[model samples]
Target chain A: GAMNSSNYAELFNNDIKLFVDDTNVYRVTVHKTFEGNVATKAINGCIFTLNPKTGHLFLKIIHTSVWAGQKRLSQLAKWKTAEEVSALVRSLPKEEQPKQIIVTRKAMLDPLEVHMLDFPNIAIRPTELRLPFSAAMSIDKLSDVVMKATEPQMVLFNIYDDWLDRISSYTAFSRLTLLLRALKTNEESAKMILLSDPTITIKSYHLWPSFTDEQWITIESQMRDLILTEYGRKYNV
Target chain B: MNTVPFTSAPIEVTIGIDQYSFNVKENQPFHGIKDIPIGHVHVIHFQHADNSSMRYGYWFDCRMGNFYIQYDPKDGLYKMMEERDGAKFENIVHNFKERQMMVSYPKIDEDDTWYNLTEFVQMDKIRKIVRKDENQFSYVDSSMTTVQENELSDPAHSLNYTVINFKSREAIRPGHEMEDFLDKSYYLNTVMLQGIFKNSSNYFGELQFAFLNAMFFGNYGSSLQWHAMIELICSSATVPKHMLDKLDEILYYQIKTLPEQYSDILLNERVWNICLYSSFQKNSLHNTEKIMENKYPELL
Candidate 1:
């Protein structure tokens, strides 16, 4: 219900993570399962894209809903055509327009959706956006790369690993926040994006030798709140 | 992108209307079992016309990042007047703690007069009391010394103070062979706090972030992030331009070499703010270098 464009932009800038899972390499393609459906209702009038090379964000979000519509399935299908996304992009202020867009598998829509962008000649450059680190890496090793990286535009981490280890999870995020702040101090525009996922659930108590299930939950909750407050929005693990 | 202000110690400035003198006491480090300096508290004092002076205190409860200040007669007795609003002392402390780092001061050249305090009051807890005018503390009115008409009228005759702990500059360098850890620690706080507060920006991002993180997690102690930040500022304190570059070198080295220490004290909200602002100064220095590069490329 938060139809505000400013909120969406705020989320886009700080919170929204494209893909937080293992397979960061995928093309985005929108499907046709929308209409009277709860899952697809959120993106009915939304188009999210980013510039992988420059770390620039582009979004075309419409504040409309399915239940609010008065027409039937046939009329609704006509209204919710592939052209709506292109039309929304064209309506944007010239400066807000995207010169190029990077997409994952889900955004690589069918020919019906593909033909919509052909008319405006908007460049759609699909690239494999790989996260810098994975879940398998040790937290210590993960931090070295995060702290040492030179001007990293966006960095994502899966919090399933030793979430309690002071170095791996705590200081890793801490260092990144400091680095981003330093960069912001250097240049106001340089906001480093951090995407961390705490969705992974540890099945075995033996994994963390020192912590119990309640302790792990507490740690996860704390990490979640920490990232939410210091960074941006929360996504999947 | 404001111009970088020059750094200097605190100064004694006469208030225009009241002709009263204002000065800040430098934080003195506390003494320990081995005669080592460990922590610090900064005292702020004001002199009355009669030579009887009232003292106020400011220091970090490093244990909680809580900014604590002691005001004279907090028992609703007498109102010590100043240009700033004499509101609730606790509220003022909170407000000041949140934004004090953002307040900036103009650079003072050699010709200007300045005074810096070295030793300060040491306390176990910083008591919170509001400033009020109604209730009477027995010695409020008659205790103050009366000023002479001539003393107030003559601009040339500025009041001079001779305090034993006053210093032209703090002496807490790494190899200075100081006996007390408290004094050095306090000096570190004073220098780093002043460096961050009266400069390019208002907020210290690193400290603020850490404080928030600690508050949310309910975990507090020695944070590597804060350790890196403080080390960065202290390391950057050397004279000439190259000292500034040494900040990152020292931070990276310390981060790599030093083991992380954890404790309950790191959870204090103000401590995090201190760390953040300290880190922010590095940004200011970085920008200052950029300006230098643009204006004087030949020097590079």
Candidate 2:
């Protein structure tokens, strides 16, 4: 079931997908929703698509409030609705289109069921069909979920919890520590699956600056220690 | 602030140091004697003889003082050249073969004229003092001008020319300011190389060898200065508190220690600065807008 009448609080939400073909052509898709309303269209947003192999690019921003003075992106093009994006995708040469698409969305929300309306000819299915934690989960539990979802080849952790406020609190800090530890331990496996996709862990360090120098130094030293110890090498700091 | 109007023209000079020969395009108006105005910043672009990208040069800022060449390996001896600015000292050169370092300067003496030595000379004055040769690597004063004239007529030989563009007075965003800061610091640090290396606790025994070994060939030297400058600017920028702390930690553990591998500084600092300056600039937009509103409310 979707996140309804629960203690869970949403921080940020987005659905992202990647499609690749045998020819190495690829396109990424993202849809950001409001308050678990998977169908709610953004007031202002942009969709950027690129075919690396063919060097084709498509960028369209709608409800341009969020990107008004962003002259760099606005100079490219603009669109009013999401349907135009689908039409552009369909217009690409068949041989240059993506064949295998990986879809990732909010964990508990009903499948957006959007592609059917826009992508009538393209067959689609959830790449791994495994449910990632929609809310905060323990490190061990998160790792278990990742290990089982190897079929996806690209497991993205959509953390919508209020990380800014959470990181400042002692209890939340401990949980954050656990979350980072899991990511570090399973780095090899995660790297193998995620490939070129963004890292699974999304940090708000730029916005919040929650961690201190002492904390980073200790964390960095500990990580270095882990690598050395795991590889059976002498540790020197 | 009053707008300072000046003609935009290029001061082109061909430089030769050992086997290396290249053209320098200094974008500023110069007339030999007067020091280029303070805060006059220009991108000093260089091009190799073969016209391949040299990827060398610096953001020459006049506020530091007149530019001077600290070392010339071909000369085989240090020339007395110094800027009469604060501290009143200049860089030294190291000779590996002789296995010794020598003081290359003393604050310029009263008699020192611009004729004998080349220390980032005024554009027009370069032609007055030096001339090219007909035979490759050969030299003579006014005689080479005739030789160059002859070569101009020859079908086989061609004179190299490069286009110079002035910095636009357009978008003044965080990115532009940061780049300006980076370039200014890079040039300042590169020129004051000895002072920087001397202050370091880490030992770089053969000054010339250490510099050529680390800086000349690749990004090792530039990368070092880049991280140092970025860390300084971000500390002042409106970045997140933790990001600032992380930068401090990164500097201490990564840069200050002088890790065995130079690439570590390049890799780690690149990512952190990328994120830091990015967010800093993002926040700067709102601040700038607010400031502009109070000052020029009509525009908004």
Candidate 3:
């Protein structure tokens, strides 16, 4: 219903994340519109995609239901008597008839969406496409490698983590909105594609690589717990 | 990718405008439509973290992120939660409060001009009111005529302000590229209102003062008298025939709200008489300097 495209371009070149709940990452994208395009630009849109096994978040600008022009006339004419307005408009001379204004939306997806998997663990070759040619990699280990390796095009978080401590913790979606908002405000992220790809994989990799047996258990538990969030189970309202 | 550490806080901000000084309290919000006269910049008063010894220094500090003055986009596959509430431009102040940053609407110059905090706000509020309380929208329509239509419930209910975005090299200042010509747009209300006020005969005398102070000076305290004079002039039908009625509507409120002062009242009445005497002239601004020096010496 609403016209989503017009004046807004993502504010920054990156995504601003507000919260990282268990495994879910939430963000928002902010854009600016010029004065003349307010009516056409207010429509909402979003895109959502992610890998279930790994903790990768992916999304795009889906569309909105608010029809800018039609909804406006309907809303204004709601309290008007149909006969009074229809009759008055009809009485106008044919040459003096009111002008019609039409609003056209902007284009979608200038860039093709591609998965950028882990870099260190995954090899980047001119011919590599499908699996990204990582040694000892498969669907089982895909989520694990993806979560740590794929570089986020844009990511944002509050300067002070302490800001979160005072407020009620945000749901995963709200956190996603924050991430997008922050990224959009950056200068470089303005002209690029920004979305969340949520994917999960299970494998063991050490942050330090040299860990005691006791430390490995604790690290494995932490990794598993983080990956299991935002997936597979109905998160109760 | 670098795991870089940037202080979530912005360290500085500078307000450039046309006359007075702004006192910025850390985390306080500043708003309004006023001009900074010239030469002074409003910097946030805070000590820099880079040097612990510099305690009395001022700077600009803010965060770089998606600041949604309104709205949340992603929920879930569908929605993980209900709609989040959005606040308008005014809500920006609320953010300033939450972020614990100092806000100042400082001007460019702090010379002979007097800055009334309330007046600065009043003018700012007036501009917002003129726009019918709407935000800027950018869209390219079917006809490709950069239509500046409002998001009003009734399309006809909104005002149309179509101005072309042009770039000119002729007016470029020394050593810099002036790529934007927004100020030159003839359709801007400020520029148009200014032109009409300058040419009107009935209120020429009063309008001249208003032009110098209101539009150029950001001087609200003296605007009341000018407003009163313009009201009388508009009521007398001095503006262009098509705009006379709307001009009257603007003058009505302005006159009614004239500040209380005996001196201003006397000046208002005198200016009203001059408007009646001169009729709205085609060129009032060109004649104002002479008039001020020769005709109304006591006022300034």
lDDT of 1 by residue, B100-145 (tens): 3322222234511111111112222122111122311111121222
**Candidate 3's error at B229, in angstroms?**
8.9
Residue lDDT tens for model 2, A1-237: 222224122211222222211111111235656665443221333333322222232433333343345433322222112233345546667654454222223310111123223343443333332222111122333334433442222223323144434333333433443334534554554233223333334343221123444654455455455545645643343
* Superposition error at A142 for model 1 (Å): 27
For model 1, what is the error of residue A235's alpha carbon versus the real structure, in angstroms, after optimal superposition? 25
Go through the candidates in order and give each one's C-alpha lDDT.
0.30, 0.30, 0.27
DockQ of each candidate, alpha-carbon based: 0.00, 0.02, 0.01
**Candidate 1 Cα outliers beyond 4 Å, as residue runs:** A1-237, B1-263, B266-300
**Which portions of model 3 show Cα errors greater than 4 Å?**
A1-237, B1-97, B100-240, B262-266, B273-300
Model 3 chain A worst lDDT run, 10 consecutive residues: A105-114
Off by over 4 Å in 2: A1-237, B1-219, B231-280, B283-300
